[PDB]
């Protein structure tokens, strides 16, 4: 029993964290096999940042301009290339701690663990979700760029996020490990704003099933709803539309608890209408949306 | 910016997790140097759990009865002894991945990271607090016994908790790494209940400072209070008493934000008597008490390990 916001054990990723320095800029890199992946903005100066021409800045660099430190050992850079917004630094040593890995691009609503690092040193691990507006509500200070988001399945690490920047609202933007940004963001200090954030409906429903599995049924009701009537109500509370894919995904949890997805959708509509009335669900006074249906099945 | 429930990086502890199987029971062990530490209830089965004489059950076990698996390698047990509610299995091989470590007993209100394991394999890491009633609101299923709680200070891992059991309310009970239970609990299948819990006041204040550091000031007010008047209010809302030690501990956060500890106490008093009024603090509608003052400073300063 119990339900916690739980991160994947970070050990497999800790052994990949390195410090990357180019001039006065220092940030984190991910050392996998003989390549160090890091944000390409490590080649920018604080002023260059408004309209950098990364191809122009990169062509002016040599392998020896990149200082890569793995613990107390300096790695030798023997090549460099740019793939979208990530810089790939070929090094002369394969990381002996390289786990079985994959690069996966995730969709909004997906969750992942973040290993927050400063100067190539892991400082903390927390759990995140890719918001529907493609930002992440992380906890990052200056120097955290290059910190990565990941999931572990079996002994395989799926790297899904690399931290690049903080937006004016305090939320974070980054790329997959192929350098493609999540969201309409660019690695430039130009005026950029996150779109209106919405609640991840499928995740809230999954969390309501987790509460039912943990013995909490107070919020249930005798009502059901159509998918269209649910979405009409959900939209008014800034909740993401629930698609038939989401309904299908909740099938296992619906079968396990005996509560049909549209029956749970009706409990959610009523919770949005009434609030919680001094009650909590799984120790929370708000509806939690950073647990996917997969996380719930895995943890419960 | 941002404030998350953040655990210590678990890598140093992952390299210590092993599977311990004795009879029909399989649980987790902590392999440090040439010793595997695990709950002593691994020697128990069905009849045993009811009324267990652990000295009697342990004396009949041979070393070869404890199957210890470290990854895909079986460790050889060359000795066994019991220290309080923890079983120590002497093995022939020192763990080459043994980090710099200490065994520390923590006090209620102190936080730690838990590396939840099943079959000697780490499955998740989460941050939690030792409640004032000595339970932990963890997330544990069957097979999680032997999972450990820890903090990291520089390069030294301080092991502070070993998971032993789940109480009927879904909360968890365990021991320090010397086998002494936190709380009035015993490792036996019997009627046991967690006492009425209280809110960790110093931790709520620390979290209010974290909210101020992150730009949330709506709850601040012009008022201050005496420590005695605050404690009279706090006792009414099942909040732990705030001592002068707590006030001193919050000094750095008070100096950083310009909000005196007793000034933040008057904010807490108004929040307790009036509520949040539809507003949230750091994305929460409840007052969070599982971040210590040190946790807030560490996260808002970026300390690495
Ligand atoms: O955002 C950035 N860094 C940070 C990243 N994360 C959390 C921070 C918190 C506090 C200060 C900085 C933080 C850098 C620097 N500031 C502008 C900028 C513009 C574009 C790009 Cl791609 C990177 C950056
Ligand atoms: O509590 C225990 N294990 C667990 C531990 N954590 C979370 C669980 C969740 C669900 C089932 C078991 C769980 C064991 C088994 N039940 C009786 C018992 C009595 C005494 C002792 Cl010391 C251990 C135990
Ligand atoms: Cl480093």
UniProtKB/Swiss-Prot annotation, chain B:
Changing residue 90 to R: In strain: Beta/B.1.351. Residues 1-305 form the Peptidase C30 domain. Changing residue 142 to A: Does not affect ability to cleave and inactivate human TRMT1. Changing residue 49 to A: Does not affect ability to cleave and inactivate human TRMT1. 3CL-PRO exists as monomer and homodimer. Only the homodimer shows catalytic activity. Interacts with host FBXO22; this interaction promotes the proteasomal degradation of nsp5. Cleaves the C-terminus of replicase polyprotein at 11 sites. Recognizes substrates containing the core sequence [ILMVF]-Q-|-[SGACN]. Cleaves and inactivates human TRMT1, preventing tRNA guanine(26)-dimethylation of tRNAs. May cleave human NLRP1 in lung epithelial cells, thereby activating the NLRP1 inflammasome pathway. May cleave human GSDMD, triggering alternative GSDME-mediated epithelial cell death upon activation of the NLRP1 inflammasome, which may enhance the release interleukins 1B, 6, 16 and 18. Also able to bind an ADP-ribose-1''-phosphate (ADRP). This is 3C-like proteinase nsp5. It comes from Severe acute respiratory syndrome coronavirus 2 (2019-nCoV). The chain holds residues 3264 to 3568 of 7096 of the full protein.
């Amino acid at each position: 029993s119990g339900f916690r916001k739980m991160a994947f054990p970070s050990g497999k990723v800790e052994g990949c964290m390195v410090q990357v320095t180019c001039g006065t800029t220092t940030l984190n890199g991910l050392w996998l096999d003989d390549v160090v992946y890091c944000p390409r903005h490590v080649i920018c100066t604080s002023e260059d940042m408004l309209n950098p021409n990364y191809e122009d800045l990169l062509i002016r660099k040599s392998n020896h301009n990149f200082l890569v430190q793995a613990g107390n050992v300096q790695l030798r850079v023997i090549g460099h290339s740019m793939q979208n917004c990530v810089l790939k630094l070929k090094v002369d040593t394969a990381n002996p701690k390289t786990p079985k890995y994959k690069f996966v691009r995730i969709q909004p609503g997906q969750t992942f663990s973040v290993l927050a690092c400063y100067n190539g040193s892991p400082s903390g691990v927390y759990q995140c979700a890719m918001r529907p507006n493609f930002t992440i509500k992380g906890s990052f200070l200056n120097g955290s760029c290059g910190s990565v988001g990941f999931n572990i399945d079996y002994d395989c690490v799926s790297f899904c996020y690399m931290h690049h920047m903080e937006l004016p609202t305090g939320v974070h933007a980054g790329t997959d490990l192929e350098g493609n940004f999540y969201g309409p963001f660019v690695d430039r200090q130009t005026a950029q704003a996150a779109g209106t954030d919405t609640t991840i409906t499928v995740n809230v429903l999954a969390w309501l099933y987790a509460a039912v599995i943990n013995g909490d049924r107070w919020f249930l009701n005798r009502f059901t709803t159509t998918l269209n009537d649910f979405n009409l109500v959900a939209m008014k509370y800034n909740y993401e539309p629930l698609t038939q894919d989401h309904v299908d995904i909740l099938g296992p949890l619906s079968a396990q608890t005996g509560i049909a997805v549209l029956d749970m959708c009706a409990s959610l509509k009523e919770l949005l209408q009434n609030g919680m009335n001094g009650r909590t669900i799984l120790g929370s006074a708000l509806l939690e949306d950073e647990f996917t249906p997969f996380d719930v099945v895995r943890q419960c």
